[PDB]
């Protein structure tokens, strides 16, 4: 097993064993699925200069396990390596889960905004901001507003109408969404306050 | 409470006139005639000027129910 | 539109369940109507 190459106390040997994990991730699954203990040792070994990318392949390990949320957290802890590539199906899965997590956290922290909010992770907010920004800059505003509404950000609709207003009927499109679809006033206040300030 | 709770439901559910007949598949045929009466009235209320084409079909058997 | 499809599937799962629960409630209520008759 290649896990021994990571088990050696040589940082260069660890690095060599963990380069190609992101390349054999597609083909080899069982050997990487059983090696959760080894990657935990590498993650704990934070004195080695490849902590971030070890957490990346740690998320790859949890890709094998099927725990997408745990892989999201491990790539979250890596930080800058959460967004290595912006176009893949596993990337789409993890961002969709992260948007759902951001939506739930935003709703509860807006329902109880008088302090004591659940800590909005800088690492999670950083990737979230990057993901819907590019989904707004992809220049497909027939779906950019739709994913923006799914993201459930208080200022995202204001951002959408302040940026390039492709298909200027999007203002009326979002008008009927807030008139008919969005009606639960408790968290609707974000969409409503933006709607009144523009119209 | 039974006849009331099956007639004053179209006030809430008229936003979904397609769901007026779906939530009464047991109320309109219930062994209690008052429950059937409320279910009938509920679809009438929630569909004021709508050609639902489904509430009418489900209300057609109730137009000749033995209970007055 | 992927969480769209996942929620539709979970909508489809429940709707398939709710078909017979309505039918079970309706048929048993008919039985109660029959015994009352």
């Amino acid at each position: 097993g290649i896990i021994s190459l990571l088990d050696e106390d040589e940082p260069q040997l660890k690095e060599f064993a963990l380069h190609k994990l992101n390349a054999v991730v597609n083909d080899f699954w069982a050997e990487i699925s059983e090696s959760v203990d080894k990657i935990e040792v590498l993650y704990e070994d934070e004195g080695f200069r490849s902590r971030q990318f070890a957490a990346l392949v740690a998320s790859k390990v949890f890709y094998h396990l099927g725990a997408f949320e745990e892989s999201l957290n491990y790539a979250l802890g890596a930080g800058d390596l959460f967004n290595v590539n912006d176009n893949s199906e596993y990337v789409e899965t993890i961002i969709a889960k992260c948007i759902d997590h951001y939506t739930k956290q935003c709703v509860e922290n807006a329902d109880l905004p008088e302090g004591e909010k659940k800590p909005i992770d800088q690492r999670l907010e950083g990737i979230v901001n990057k993901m819907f920004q590019r989904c707004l800059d992809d220049h497909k505003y027939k779906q950019a507003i739709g994913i923006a509404l799914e993201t459930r950000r208080l200022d995202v609709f204001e951002k959408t109408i302040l940026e390039s207003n492709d298909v200027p009927g999007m203002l009326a499109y979002s008008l009927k969404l807030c008139m008919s679809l969005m009606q639960n006033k408790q968290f609707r206040n974000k969409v409503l306050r933006v709607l009144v300030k523009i119209y | 409470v039974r006849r009331a709770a099956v007639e004053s439901l179209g006030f809430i559910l008229f936003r979904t006139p397609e769901q007026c007949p779906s939530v009464v598949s047991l109320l309109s045929e219930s062994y209690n005639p008052h429950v059937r009466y409320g279910a009938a009235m509920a679809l009438g209320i929630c569909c004021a000027g709508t050609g639902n084409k489904e509430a009418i079909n489900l209300l057609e058997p109730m137009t000749n129910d033995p209970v007055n | 539109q992927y969480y769209l499809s996942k929620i539709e599937e979970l909508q489809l799962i429940v709707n398939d369940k709710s078909q017979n629960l309505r039918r079970l409630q309706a048929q048993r209520n008919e039985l109660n109507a029959k015994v009352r008759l």
Binding site: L177 | - | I7, V14, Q25
Partner: peptide, 25 residues
């Protein structure tokens, strides 16, 4: 659009399943 439409849709269908399931007792 269809994202939240299906969201609420799941909620409502789910509700009438359990509510109509409450009468079997």
């Amino acid at each position: 659009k269809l994202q939240q439409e299906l969201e609420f849709l799941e909620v409502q269908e789910e509700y009438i399943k359990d509510e109509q399931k409450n009468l079997k007792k």
